[PDB]
Amino acid sequence: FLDGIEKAQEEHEKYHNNWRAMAEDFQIPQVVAKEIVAQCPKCQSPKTWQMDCTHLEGKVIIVAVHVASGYIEAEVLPAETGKETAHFLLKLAARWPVKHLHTDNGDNFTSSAVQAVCWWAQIEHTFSVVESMNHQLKTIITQIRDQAEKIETAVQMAVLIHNFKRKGGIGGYSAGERIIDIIASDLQTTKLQNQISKIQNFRVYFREGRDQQWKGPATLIWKGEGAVVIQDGQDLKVVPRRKCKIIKDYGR
Amino acid sequence: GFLDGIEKAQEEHEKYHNNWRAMAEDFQIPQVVAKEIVAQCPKCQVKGEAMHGQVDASPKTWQMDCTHLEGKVIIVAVHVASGYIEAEVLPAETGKETAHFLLKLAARWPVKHLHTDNGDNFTSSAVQAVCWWAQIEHTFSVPYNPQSHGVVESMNHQLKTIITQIRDQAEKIETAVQMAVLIHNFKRKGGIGGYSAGERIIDIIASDLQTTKLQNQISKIQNFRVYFREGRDQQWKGPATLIWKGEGAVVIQDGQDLKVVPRRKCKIIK
Amino acid sequence: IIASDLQTTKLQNQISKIQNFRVYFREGRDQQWKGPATLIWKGEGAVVIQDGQDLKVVPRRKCKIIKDY
Amino acid sequence: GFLDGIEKAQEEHEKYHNNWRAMAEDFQIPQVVAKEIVAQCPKCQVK
């Protein structure tokens, strides 16, 4: 156990590993490995989208793209007012978690209706990838145009072929697998951070061997079934449970 | 004896239609005879068997239905294993708009199985052509039995309660529909893992892909075949693939079927 | 000759006593009870019956299956 | 139903005076009514 913590600290001092790899290699819990990463001075987005409008056959196609994965959602608009752009943004924010929207300085994007939608759904709008996505979508649309009667069917068939049928990148994944893996990794991070804060609201008085007195207040990191890991004096150490007292702390 | 009582009980049931306890007490026949007299009458037998079944909950199954609100037509689709909702307002209840809603849904999320009722928009050639092109299995419920798709009708109820909660913050009904979808998907927690519906659909689909890749890498380097003895007759079946050897039993795969066999009836050969 | 007819009558007795069931079901928009039909397949939740040379699927909650002694 | 079996077994015991296990296996009636058919005959006895 403590040998695993010592090997993890020496290996991070050499190579600066991440906490998932250290927890899987050295067989330590994840809160301990995250503390080892968080104590290092040299070691201290999944919700950003971009939007644009374009033209095809006299129609208006609005395109939104998830940036870290390349994931496309598109639609055909009857006009280019601010109310239709606000309805598209409200549908997108109701289906995927959107926190940061990046657009250009168009007219319909600089509007009171889009501003009211961003106020209600709590999005950060920023005015200045989508050009490459418009070119790629237009090549697929021309590649499958003879199978559809209307332009709306061809647009949605091209979105399906782009998202699930084209493979590339490092491991040969599509865009849907990449967006799902990215958001799932972020969810794991936030749940572990909630556990970390709830544990770190405590305090530990511990008694070393060959002494009767209690030492200073060390902060609890992990409380197991038979052992207790504490941080004290910028040092992580493992004390048995029969030489410890854990009390609540009020130091806000 | 009671054989004359059997004859009088048959005449009595032919006139009055007694239940079995009345005949078994008034004619002093055994209860099996009285139950048979009642069971051979067609004017009786008006009662079901009092149980419920259980719908399909595979990780790529969706259910779809339509509802009405303030003179409009809403169309609701639910992901069954997680509870994830998509919804829209249709200008008409035809088959063209239903085919376009299904095409957009199949472009956004992976759909392989769809369950619907027998309305005129879901049994249509446009929805048939979209399911053919996008490779979906479309199944229909038993007619006039809404319990076969209980998840989407329960979500009709939840959507209407949220819409009445936030009705005064919007002007039109399409705005209030999309605000209700956001509040259901992301602002309500509680359930299997303490998740919301968006977190649950992310966890379910990511877990599906991860576990296929892991057991592909495990099974591509396996060995230690197992010959096992099972059945009513003590025969011996051929090459089976050992998957996991445990404290008490082993797990084998035979002809693409999973089986759990104890250690006394199997022999491992490297 | 006689013993073969004894074996044939025994096997036909077991075959006839396996699956001679009657089904009273309830179907339609106005859910009325209808006459006896022949059971074909019985799964958990629903059954498939043959009535008047027509196959129908009824749930097990809307049908009664009568066996023989 | 076995009600026609009860009538047929009564005719058959009136001819040949069967026992009760024979009638209960041949005519597929329950054992209580077959024992009662043997009990009502003044010449036979259930054994």
Add this chain to the structure above:
Amino acid sequence: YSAGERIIDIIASDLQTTKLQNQISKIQNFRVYFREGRDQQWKGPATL
């Protein structure tokens, strides 16, 4: 075979052995919620 195919095959087989022993525990770190017969509540977290 030449030398490059030999060195690639050797390191690949060694990696497959050690990663097998880790991947089994990795696949057993999932949790399953299941349903038995004629009971309509989802039973607790068994292990896959």
Add this chain to the structure above:
DNA sequence: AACTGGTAGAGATTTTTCTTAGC
């Protein structure tokens, strides 16, 4: 401040009764 769901049947599970073979 003084009001309110219930009835009966279809199967499943547990218990009692009855015949017969073995020691």
Add this chain to the structure above:
DNA sequence: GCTAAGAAAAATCTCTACCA
């Protein structure tokens, strides 16, 4: 003659639809 295995017949327990 006494005892126990096996099966038949009876008793109890849980669950469902319909009543404007």
Add this chain to the structure above:
DNA sequence: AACTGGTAGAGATTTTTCTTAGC
């Protein structure tokens, strides 16, 4: 021959956590 009720909230009961007095 291959079909099927479910979702989420209001209380009641059981369990875990936290402070303080007594020996």
Add this chain to the structure above:
DNA sequence: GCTAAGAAAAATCTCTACCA
């Protein structure tokens, strides 16, 4: 310093209406 009573806060279990 150690132990137990008491109460607060959290976790589990049973039951209901509505969905054309």
